[PDB]
Amino acid sequence: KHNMKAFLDELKAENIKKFLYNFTQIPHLAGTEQNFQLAKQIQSQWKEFGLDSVELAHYDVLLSYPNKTHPNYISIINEDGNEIFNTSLFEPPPPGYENVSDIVPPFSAFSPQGMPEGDLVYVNYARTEDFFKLERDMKINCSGKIVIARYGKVFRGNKVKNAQLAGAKGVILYSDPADYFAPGVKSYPDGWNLPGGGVQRGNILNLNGAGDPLTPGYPANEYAYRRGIAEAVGLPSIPVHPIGYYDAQKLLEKMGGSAPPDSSWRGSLKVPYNVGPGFTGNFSTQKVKMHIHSTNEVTRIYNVIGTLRGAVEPDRYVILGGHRDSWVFGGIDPQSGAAVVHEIVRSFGTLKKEGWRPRRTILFASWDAEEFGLLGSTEWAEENSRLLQERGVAYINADSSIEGNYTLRVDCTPLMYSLVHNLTKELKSPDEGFEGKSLYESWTKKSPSPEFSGMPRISKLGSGNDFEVFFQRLGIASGRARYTKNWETNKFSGYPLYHSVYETYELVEKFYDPMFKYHLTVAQVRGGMVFELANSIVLPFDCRDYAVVLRKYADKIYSISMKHPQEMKTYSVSFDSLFSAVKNFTEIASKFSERLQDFSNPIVLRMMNDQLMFLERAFIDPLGLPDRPFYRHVIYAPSSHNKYAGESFPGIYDALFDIESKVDPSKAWGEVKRQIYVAAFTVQAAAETLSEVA
Amino acid sequence: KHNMKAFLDELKAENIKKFLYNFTQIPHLAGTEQNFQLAKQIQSQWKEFGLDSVELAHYDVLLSYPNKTHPNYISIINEDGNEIFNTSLFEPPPPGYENVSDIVPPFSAFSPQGMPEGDLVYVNYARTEDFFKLERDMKINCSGKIVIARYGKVFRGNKVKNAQLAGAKGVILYSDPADYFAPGVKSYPDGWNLPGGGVQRGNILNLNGAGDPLTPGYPANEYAYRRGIAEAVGLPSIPVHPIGYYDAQKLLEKMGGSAPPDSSWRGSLKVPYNVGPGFTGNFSTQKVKMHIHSTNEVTRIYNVIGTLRGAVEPDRYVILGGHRDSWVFGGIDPQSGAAVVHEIVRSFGTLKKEGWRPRRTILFASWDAEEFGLLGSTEWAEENSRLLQERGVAYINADSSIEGNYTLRVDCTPLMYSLVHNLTKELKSPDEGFEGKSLYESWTKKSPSPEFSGMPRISKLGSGNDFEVFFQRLGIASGRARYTKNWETNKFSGYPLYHSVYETYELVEKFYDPMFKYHLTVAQVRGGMVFELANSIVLPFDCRDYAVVLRKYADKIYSISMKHPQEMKTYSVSFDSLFSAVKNFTEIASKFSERLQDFSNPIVLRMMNDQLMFLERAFIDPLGLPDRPFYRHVIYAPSSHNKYAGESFPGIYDALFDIESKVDPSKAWGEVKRQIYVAAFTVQAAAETLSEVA
Numbered sequence A, B: 001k002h003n004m005k006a007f008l009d010e011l012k013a014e015n016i017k018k019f020l021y022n023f024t025q026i027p028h029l030a031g032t033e034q035n036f037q038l039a040k041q042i043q044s045q046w047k048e049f050g051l052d053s054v055e056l057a058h059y060d061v062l063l064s065y066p067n068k069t070h071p072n073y074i075s076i077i078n079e080d081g082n083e084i085f086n087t088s089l090f091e092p093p094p095p096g097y098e099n100v101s102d103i104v105p106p107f108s109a110f111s112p113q114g115m116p117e118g119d120l121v122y123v124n125y126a127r128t129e130d131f132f133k134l135e136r137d138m139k140i141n142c143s144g145k146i147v148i149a150r151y152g153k154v155f156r157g158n159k160v161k162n163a164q165l166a167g168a169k170g171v172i173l174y175s176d177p178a179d180y181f182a183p184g185v186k187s188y189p190d191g192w193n194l195p196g197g198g199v200q201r202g203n204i205l206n207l208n209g210a211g212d213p214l215t216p217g218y219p220a221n222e223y224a225y226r227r228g229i230a231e232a233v234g235l236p237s238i239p240v241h242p243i244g245y246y247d248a249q250k251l252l253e254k255m256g257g258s259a260p261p262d263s264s265w266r267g268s269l270k271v272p273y274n275v276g277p278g279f280t281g282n283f284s285t286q287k288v289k290m291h292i293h294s295t296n297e298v299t300r301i302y303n304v305i306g307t308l309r310g311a312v313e314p315d316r317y318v319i320l321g322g323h324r325d326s327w328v329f330g331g332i333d334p335q336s337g338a339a340v341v342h343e344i345v346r347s348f349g350t351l352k353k354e355g356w357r358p359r360r361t362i363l364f365a366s367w368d369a370e371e372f373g374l375l376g377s378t379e380w381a382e383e384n385s386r387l388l389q390e391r392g393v394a395y396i397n398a399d400s401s402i403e404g405n406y407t408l409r410v411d412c413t414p415l416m417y418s419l420v421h422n423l424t425k426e427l428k429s430p431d432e433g434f435e436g437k438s439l440y441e442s443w444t445k446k447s448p449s450p451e452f453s454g455m456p457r458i459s460k461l462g463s464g465n466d467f468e469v470f471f472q473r474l475g476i477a478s479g480r481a482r483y484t485k486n487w488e489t490n491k492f493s494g495y496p497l498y499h500s501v502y503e504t505y506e507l508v509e510k511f512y513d514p515m516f517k518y519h520l521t522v523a524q525v526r527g528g529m530v531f532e533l534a535n536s537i538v539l540p541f542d543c544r545d546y547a548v549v550l551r552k553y554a555d556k557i558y559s560i561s562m563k564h565p566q567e568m569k570t571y572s573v574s575f576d577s578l579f580s581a582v583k584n585f586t587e588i589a590s591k592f593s594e595r596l597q598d599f600s601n602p603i604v605l606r607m608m609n610d611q612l613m614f615l616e617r618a619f620i621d622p623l624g625l626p627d628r629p630f631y632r633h634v635i636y637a638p639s640s641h642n643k644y645a646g647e648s649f650p651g652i653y654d655a656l657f658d659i660e661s662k663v664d665p666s667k668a669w670g671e672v673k674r675q676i677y678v679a680a681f682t683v684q685a686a687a688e689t690l691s692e693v694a
Ligand SMILES: *[C@@H]1O[C@H](CO)[C@@H](O[C@@H]2O[C@H](CO)[C@@H](O[C@@H]3O[C@H](CO)[C@@H](O)[C@H](O[C@H]4O[C@H](CO)[C@@H](O)[C@H](O)[C@@H]4O)[C@@H]3O)[C@H](O)[C@H]2NC(C)=O)[C@H](O)[C@H]1NC(C)=O
Pocket: A577, A578, A580, A581, A584, A680, A681, A684, B222
């Protein structure tokens, strides 16, 4: 039989291992020859594996690279202008890789050039609330200062935006052992902790879903018109550079000015964590000087696009996509995910060679330039938006398969909750002490839902990965799954080696998943989800699960507004319409579910599958969210304070955020009411797509 | 048999006559009780006629009305401030209607209030080129002047925009007998010409597709958040009032300053048509004073929405819509169209009662507040945009069935050219001297295509009617047809009584269509088009017709750019990508047509019908056109200079328009190139929706 069980049994841990090894022997930085060579390899193998068609789709996008002959670094400089301390020019390479070429040195992609000098201010995680605390409570002014911030908690792009708006003239990012060094584990190569010389690479853009900075709206093809750099989307206006904790220590140890406001501001280094500005007493005339010479350059990138044509509905697309470009070796990010995709394609291809085809078309994608701002997936979606809008059933992401070895983590649209619960009940738990138990059981035990007993936690989608254009811009039901750490122990990284040279095949094989069983489990979840989305006669979406969460999010946003009862009275701010729309959605969804259970008629079916498919689509507002035209989903957007986190009813949330500080409360509360209207309308309009069609 | 012939034979001229009489005995001004009563009547009759469901959909939108107790008028005022001449407070009512209540006096809907005084400047038709001629060639400055303009040539809203941007402080619109009085025909009631006391009502908004001024983007429902008036879309900033030619004569006869620049500026009144500013010699101290006291008020409007559920594809909608509100009696505009819709519904209903149903769902609409800016159709489409976007096959408009008695006029998407040619070959010509000949023959003889021998003229869609939201905003294939005048004789109105109290049932019955045969022919064309769109197994769209016109429009825009060869060389402006995209569209469309001819498989069919349906949709850009976010179709938009006319490749056209006057040619030519890119991309993307889907 050709069924999901045949698909799943064909997946092998040993294949995933072989592929991960294959993909991580040299760096595959976006826009480099080696990543083009890997693209061509993946293309050839996917064809070998049996896909109907496998093409490269290329774009010429803005990327950023250090200058090979004019290295970036930071100094402490004395009154005479002698540089008395310099940060490192590279991470000491790991054992056996000390002769590997083309390791990009740590840098912040898209930093402008500059050599600003000044006094340091320490800003904790550089979150919105850290700057509130500095400026409002401590009366510390960041204007004209170089800010130093620890990585963690939020997307580093948001940190840089926040520092810019505080008037900083430069930003230094560092990894604090409080956040990147787990107690009682050794530094790489002897354990999975970040060494003092390790540094986290990463882009610092604020694209808000735009894709390539030069071509928002349109693919960056051969004849594209490009914005000038001064009009580019999302570029930071001040120099930024990342360093490890050995170097950070040397920068922080001399810090003077105000004490940290409380212990949530202290990391684990042996320094006071003084906020500054500037150094204590004897060193008060010393400054910090940055030297950034990176350049932005339009560079060719290559996605691999594989197609397995559907037997019955070839014009319905289920997409499995994840990126292939890495900062250095990408042992976890992304190749632990890409090796899984490779095995999934191989398995589907084995069935295809035996005469099977899925009901709907499956598209497989190896995205490029994800690390520079989701550029590959976003340009390809801009190119193909009309096909995706009208034909796209679902998008399943496939970045890092592991960030820990503790339990499953899934983030997806509510439309896939039921699919995920059912599939995980049919898979074996890989966990020690759950042998012979289902993945659902182990997951639910380790990561219980906060709302319901006997259910597992499933989170909303945030962003900072390649599902962003499919979900937040285009409104295609999207999901992701991976193995993760125990977030109950502490909220620190389950992979501190993230974006460092130490993130290697050996890291994975020695410390995370020596038997590749977590990778195999993740291949079964991602692969199984794609199998069911592509093969189930009725799309495996339960619209009733959206109704339950919509009520949750409405209760939540209402409770935020209710902190301001006087203003709600004064400006007649009512959530009645939103609750009414949510009630209607619940009633209509329930009736639709009954018809879906109760109808041999392929037009009714397809009509009903179209209503299922276009339901996520109905939450798209073509006017987008305020000043974020590429975030169009009215229920979910990336948090304006942290691109990685999702926010529910983002339009209302942002209108309410910090509202007591607005200088014109009438105007601010007007805008709250406007967003309530937009949300109520969109929920009601989505509900009505599920009514009888005539 | 239940076939198109049974549908068509059931339509009766005598029924259309009875319905027109019924709909035109009292005024049906938008937002008034009488128009609500007519809505309820139409709703009841449509149910009687056999529709499955007939509902009112209501909205609360900004409308505008004169003040009943503080009438609008214009004066000539002397040095002492004595008003020595006053324009009329009402049109003398026609025979037998001298006791009819609630005739709205002539006014310009949405004029602000004011009583500006000043010197007159005569600006011809107040077109873009008329203001160029005044300001650039004649050196006449309109700033602080009251402008007087003759109606004709362009939408009156554009005139007012142009006058505002010239710095006018008020606008007087008048009907010149050159444009509204055909030689050798008598004035109403003795012929169809405009009498000296007749006045053209009409809104003067510049909505650019927004719909209700207060709620752009969202339907104006019960909980809608409204903009404040100062942020409303499209309202004029200076007072405007319309007058007849008796009054115009009194205002123009004293005009001094410069002679008219040439004879294209002279109308037919016995006056010099001096441009001004101000009066000659003896009257140089006299001024013109406007008194406008109209008020804008949020008012309830009602669309009637009738549904005839499809037997096989109930989730595919073919819409027949036209408005019901009129300025006064609406003898032509809109009731000559609405009586036709009524008979069409009656006919479809007769078949339904005998057991027939169309394959796809047919929606019938009686739109309200069309005359105040397409408000009814636009709010309903904003409410239902997700259903329309994913399910809308075609929209057929049904305003005025006649504007002349000479030949057919059709404006539609190229996707319907073939349908229109085939249908009109199967209909009988109503024309004297073509008895026993087809409508195609008489039409093609009287209105030959400029490009092809033996084909009739079919024009592109402009705007200024209810298809605008369906076509230019949402991208649903749209068309319209009516009987028209001989545009070869002269380009003057074929109905000069437009929007005047004289536009009555008797006007139609006595002077246009005493046998109602032109109305019947138009019912057969509109009804037949709806029948075929709703019943043909394969959607009756020929994508190859789009390829032919795209090449025409590309040649055209290229020839406009080529007037500037030096700049094209300097800025490297190439149309290569646009022609390449048009070539690709032609090749792909041709291959698609072959498959469409060459495939018992309902999924292939429906897949192919979806490709046909979504083809018009593929020309939508979700970012819209520059500063016109509700005009999203990249091939067609209403002309920025004349809402009634369509413009092809509007984005490129507007970037090129008057480019030699731009102060920064580098920037202007950059923007031309950007629009070329957007157009090439969109054409290629549309083409790719017709490729094999996997
Ligand atoms: C959830 O679904 C329900 C349908 O079950 C839907 O209920 C609808 O609510 C609207 C808005 O409140 C109702 O609108 C009314 O319609 C009648 C005509 O049917 C009008 O006469 C009403 O207007 C009068 O009263 C107003 C309110 O006091 C006055 O402001 C106004 O000036 C008039 O005096 C009013 O417009 C509508 O009839 C129901 N539809 C039903 C019951 O079928 C509800 O809107 C949905 N929720 C959302 C958010 O869409």
